Subunit: 439 residues, 3 copies
Amino acid sequence: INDSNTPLHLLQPAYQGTYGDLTPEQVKKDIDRVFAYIDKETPARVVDKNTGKVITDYTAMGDEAQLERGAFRLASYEWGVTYSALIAAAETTGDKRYTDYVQNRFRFLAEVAPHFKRVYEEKGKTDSQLLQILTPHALDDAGAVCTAMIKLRLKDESLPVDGLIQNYFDFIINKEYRLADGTFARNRPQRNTLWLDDMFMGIPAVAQMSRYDKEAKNKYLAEAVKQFLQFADRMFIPEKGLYRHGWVESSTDHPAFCWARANGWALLTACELLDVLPEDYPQRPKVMDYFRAHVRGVTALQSGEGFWHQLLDCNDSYLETSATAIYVYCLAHAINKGWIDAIAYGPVAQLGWHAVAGKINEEGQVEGTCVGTGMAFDPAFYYYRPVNVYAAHGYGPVLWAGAEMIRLLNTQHPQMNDSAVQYYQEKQKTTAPIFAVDS
Amino acid sequence: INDSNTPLHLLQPAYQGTYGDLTPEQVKKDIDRVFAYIDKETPARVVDKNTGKVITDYTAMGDEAQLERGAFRLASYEWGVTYSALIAAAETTGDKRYTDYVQNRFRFLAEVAPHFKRVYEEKGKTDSQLLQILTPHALDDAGAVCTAMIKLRLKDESLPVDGLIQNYFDFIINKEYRLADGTFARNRPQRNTLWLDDMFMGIPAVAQMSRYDKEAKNKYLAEAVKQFLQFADRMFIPEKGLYRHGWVESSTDHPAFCWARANGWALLTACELLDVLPEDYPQRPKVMDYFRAHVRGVTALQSGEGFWHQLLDCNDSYLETSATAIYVYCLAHAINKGWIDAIAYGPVAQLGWHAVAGKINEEGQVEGTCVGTGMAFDPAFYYYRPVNVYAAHGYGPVLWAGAEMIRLLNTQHPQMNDSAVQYYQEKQKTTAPIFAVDS
Amino acid sequence: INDSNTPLHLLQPAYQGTYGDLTPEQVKKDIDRVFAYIDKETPARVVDKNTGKVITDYTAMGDEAQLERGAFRLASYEWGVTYSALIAAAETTGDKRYTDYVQNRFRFLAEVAPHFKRVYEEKGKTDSQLLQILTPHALDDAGAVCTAMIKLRLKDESLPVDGLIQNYFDFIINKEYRLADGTFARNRPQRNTLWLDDMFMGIPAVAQMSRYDKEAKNKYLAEAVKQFLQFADRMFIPEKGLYRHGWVESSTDHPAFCWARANGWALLTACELLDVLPEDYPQRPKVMDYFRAHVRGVTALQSGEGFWHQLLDCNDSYLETSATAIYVYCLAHAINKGWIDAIAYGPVAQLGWHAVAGKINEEGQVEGTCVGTGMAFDPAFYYYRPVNVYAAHGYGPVLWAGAEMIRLLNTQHPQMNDSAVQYYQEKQKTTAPIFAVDS
């Protein structure tokens, strides 16, 4: 084996993860494993908190009743993402089990919410999970879930979630704290702080409400855009093509910690907003320009393992799964929508999927996901955020990425060429390992 | 332990070093350990170089006499930093032992210098340590020590260091080699070379002399500023917010090796100069702008361990203690002075202190300090500079950083919020792990 | 051993590879080891492909005849580089063995080519290595070899390579696929793709043909420049000072994978072109500006080990030998030619040579060379390219770098100063470890 008798250029590279060909059947097998797992870990039942006995007489129950505790909460913002993912997966795969799940959980929450409200009113206390639904106090308690409920209800008028949607959205649009200019804000950890996460916690709900409330379509399109641009003005870093995680209004400098998951939330927000805006919307160009600039900054920092780093621009920080999945979804979606180039980005998405699929264990858990994480102004905090299989943030994104990869693989015609994944818009009529595209 | 039954977001991160709360008492305990150590390793006595017998009849001694050799030289530029550090520490802590040390060493050097001069004149030879004091040949032999002597003498007219100050400063201002435009320069390793280190070796002395010589105040303020800006024009790299270690006038390109300690010296020079300049000094804005830009470039490159890298912009180069300490001092000082934002930078300084305190061993030595280091035009030289507990460069900076951290902690009200260090200007009236700041 | 009794600043650093002084004799010893090895692995004989029996009656042979297979192919583009390297090495060292080798191989190929053509015409098949020579189909099949043949023939009118040169160049200039604007291009892996490698596969041949065909000098100088600038417009990344490996015309974004070897090919192309252009050529300034900007971008990313990384701007990608060697050649050449500064770059080249020489094993093989590598749009492909001693790409560059380092060391007067390699244009009259340059 030498230069004269071997194509050294065709030697099998020693990848640590998987590389190369991907079939939509394999992607579906993997999201089905995650789906089967989360299905059994998100029970839609009321039980006695002391004995675990199933409660079915909701009119009679009291402060002993709670939602059965599986590994993941049904109405956390993390699960808001899962619900949106499964709505999308039903569409790209045609597997109605995915939407049956969302139907079932939403109908269950709609059914029981009023009874728990009555318990709270009579007893002064109830399941803390129900207080999140009934009395949200932050966009984290409302937006992602509200967004998914709007999406499904617009596909099914029989879905009885209007009461929940109105409650959630009344909080978002009328009660949530904002800066003087209206930008969704927090007073933690500092007064008048913007969190990159709130682009995603707040904007998709507003964008979807423009579709749900006919009377307020223009008003909500404009508010969704206004939020987007008021956040991006302050938080985007044009020199890097990345967003800072936080921005404190009083601070005279605004240090950038380009945390991967929140950068995922910003990329996903652009996708959610661009899914709704009319193609001739007058501010669409500015939003699209921001999206495209962010795509370029994020993708340049993909690691050799296909994952992205916890701090995106710090290649000594750990590789994190949930952000990686979010980016894969966004990139596949943007290619599918015609927003970004398939030749340039298809292989990025594909490699990212290989990376993510390698973290779906035999049980269907998603490994390597950063746990719930707030805002810091030092790098040690970010570098050392724990990872755990039970961090709920991994699940939605993996499902959504898989769903979108199936669409991408069913539309495009990727093929290995010279040992590299290449995207082709027409099927190449060759099995040669190295080839030129015909005229 | 899962998403439903655990706050995974409150799990204890597996830090390698310490993180979080810091009390001024702990900082003081640590600088006291360093102080006790250096006190016993910097003897202020004359001994016979052959027998070690203590010499007290200075009028009678000859070329056998030398300063007793402890681990660290009393009048090296490294110890010039230590003296300035201890002057500062006495002020922020109120511990007069720190200034007693400086008083003692300076009075000893003032006392013996004239006798060693007489030995040199009569015998043609004396202790090489005394030749550095009596006949300096480089800013390294004069500036940092002269600066500290001016600082203390202005606080104590009984301190008999005027002869030493005049000798040192005559060298600096009249004998030191300069470029055509007056910028302090060297002819090593190449003709007409600027060393970033000389910002610190030369400028603070000139700035302090403006305070010491009433007649020449304006002249020395102007020269200090002129040096600063003539160095920064050539050596600052605006695209990085960092300084190059060296600049050779003849070279048509000026490669940047952003060596951490010398970048510390440049940051410290800005602090020393800004401590002296009137707030309405006409060139102060340009100096402040340079300082602020350097702060932003340095802080962005802090590692996940709180240390900075030997080459700042090379995250594969070793983490170095002395530079880290210098940055901590500069950042705490700038916050204390109102030059930079506390919310943005307090946690940077605090993490850096945790990092540094972890390198103060039980003996009181400072580990991980880069040894004396000249100028190169290749990266291997910088990457492989040895570290040693006896590198004197670590001591001053750790003491000075600790002193300034005590001030910072006694003024600000930092507190953990959502597992991250946050700086508050008013004490928050809560022990909740996660909280919003009140209106 | 402490601060008072030891120059800690003069302690021996624990380098992993070699550092410091380099003699032209040592460099020559190392290239002689590589040369002896490749000499025995590149046999210039025809043999029966079944038995290995040497064939000397070329007029009588048939489709059984092939070039004897040693470890490296005689007319691959990799060996085109080797031939140019050895022409250069003969000049800087005066060792005629180097040019005797090239003479021998070129005369052998000139002698046998017509016989193999006759076999191909009569039998319909022949040695695939001869089909590359006789019927090139890509610049890889022609340019580098053609370039070397022109170079030697212009030094020796008796070298009977005009038929091969005309055949190769007819392909390059008239048959090779180009973009609409004339830029040499490929239709793999995508339609209308530019490969950074083709700067080197195509431009030097065109530049040399301007010297070989008197009638077409102006025409070929202009075409060489036009190619250079049409490639660089699209492929250079001014913000990084680096080139992207690929550029697909249809893509709306052009992702940058700054692959080290192809960046070497672009740097080498500038050297080959600048060797030919008149110093008053009207577009020379634009070419020189591109060269100088690339020098600055490449050199800033040299690792602490002296090697450069497989993806230049990804410090977590492997250190690669062939690119490193190419850069060393380019830098030494540019210093020797007066194009870049010796003080700034001599130590870069010198360290790079130490790095490369450490990969020349006792057998004379070159270790750590990336195998033949095509174009990807994901980083995993690049990060995981295999390395192999039989990758032919290492040999030419090491030889050429060594040859040019000998010239550099025989012209300049480098010397250790303060433990760092420093370049001096006049021999310094001192053996002191640390010194100032005299007035």
